[PDB]
Design goal:
Residues 74-317 form the Peptidase C16 domain. May form homohexamers. Interacts with N protein. By secondary structure, the protein is α+β, with helices and mostly antiparallel strands. The protein has a domain at 185-314: Jelly Rolls (Sandwich), CATH 2.60.120.1680. Helices cover 26% and strands 36% of the residues. The strands form 4 sheets. A 7-stranded mixed β-sheet has the order 10-13-18-14-15-16-17. A hairpin with a 2-residue loop joins strand 6 and strand 7. It starts with 6 loop residues before the first strand and ends with a strand. The chain binds chloride ion, sodium ion (2 copies) and zinc ion (ZN). One sodium ion is lined by residues 88-89, 92, 161-162.
Length: 317
């Protein structure tokens, strides 16, 4: 026997701004009508419409020409599963806590998220503007204290699920790919006693990141690196134009001196079985570990990333 058809009006979206009116049959699941569907992060694909859902907004995958354009303009991605990864992470990050620690939005530990807490604290201390409007909107909310959307977007952009381990340097590199760093320029010189000098110019993300030493002062004086001839070449910073620099190295015992750096990330333990902490240099040295806070006049620990302020630098060598 035919059951009389019942419908409700709902809206679908890929960006929570542009809405698309839909009339849904309450005898069929959201999945049968829209494909994978989410209500504020919760997966409702296998759910049949409820009367209470009338007029609500549901996220869907951008599986039509209009949604494809709206999703590209908002997120700067055409990765087919992006929206699903974003919603899946959001269902968890909306339950995390974001305490204000020393005036910054932190994240209380959950789901192995210490790498995200130190990335978030770091972003609030360096001059950086995101390109996708999704990151601009969510980062503004994160700075105000509501970082759930921003954290779920970091996870989606980095291809990490909630609970999955992450590397801070890798996470910052992904975020920098979605930032406006076109005014950043680095000029390096590599000198070999045999092979001579070779100058290189780096732009954008490559102009603000360096892997090999934590010391910006030592990078300016010269660092010893291998040469193709077998000898050691000296690489030094000739020119730098950027509002910050990020120096990274495999974690090792290192002394952080108050007033000589902006902030840093510490990794205690072996690779894939450790924990990150954040050190910020303000009136004194503050150590932020998610919701936890301690202070000290000096600091020594296994540091893996250090951030420094910059504007314009030219060598004397
Ligand atoms: Cl921004
Ligand atoms: Na997830
Ligand atoms: Na972590
Ligand atoms: Zn050489």
């Amino acid at each position: 026997s035919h059951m009389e058809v019942r419908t409700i009006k709902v809206f679908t979206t890929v960006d929570n701004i542009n809405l698309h009116t839909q009339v849904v049959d309450m005898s069929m699941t959201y999945g049968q009508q829209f494909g994978p569907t989410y209500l504020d992060g919760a997966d409702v694909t296998k759910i049949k419409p409820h009367n209470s859902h009338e007029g609500k907004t549901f996220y869907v995958l951008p599986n039509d020409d209009t949604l494809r354009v709206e999703a590209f303009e908002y997120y700067h991605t055409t990765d087919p599963s992006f929206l699903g990864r974003y919603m899946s992470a959001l269902n968890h990050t909306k339950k995390w806590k974001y305490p204000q620690v020393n005036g910054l939005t932190s994240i209380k530990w959950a789901d192995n998220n210490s790498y995200l807490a130190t990335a978030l604290l770091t972003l609030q201390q360096i001059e950086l503007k995101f390109n996708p409007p999704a990151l601009q909107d969510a980062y503004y909310r994160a700075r105000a204290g509501e970082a759930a959307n921003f954290c779920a977007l970091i996870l989606a952009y980095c291809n990490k699920t909630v609970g999955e381990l992450g590397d801070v340097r890798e996470t910052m590199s992904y975020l920098f790919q979605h930032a406006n760093l076109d005014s950043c320029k680095r000029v390096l010189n590599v000198v070999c006693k045999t092979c001579g000098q070779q100058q290189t110019t780096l732009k954008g993300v490559e102009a603000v990141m360096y892997m090999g030493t934590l010391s910006y002062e030592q990078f300016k004086k010269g660092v010893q690196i291998p040469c193709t001839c077998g000898k050691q070449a000296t690489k030094y910073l000739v020119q730098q134009e950027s509002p910050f620099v990020m120096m990274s190295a495999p974690p090792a015992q290192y002394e952080l001196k108050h007033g000589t750096f902006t902030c840093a990330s510490e990794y205690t333990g072996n690779y894939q079985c450790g924990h990150y902490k954040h050190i910020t240099s303000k009136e004194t040295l503050y150590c932020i570990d998610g919701a936890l806070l301690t202070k000290s006049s000096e600091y020594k620990g296994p540091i893996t990333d250090v951030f420094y302020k910059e504007n314009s630098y030219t060598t004397t060598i």
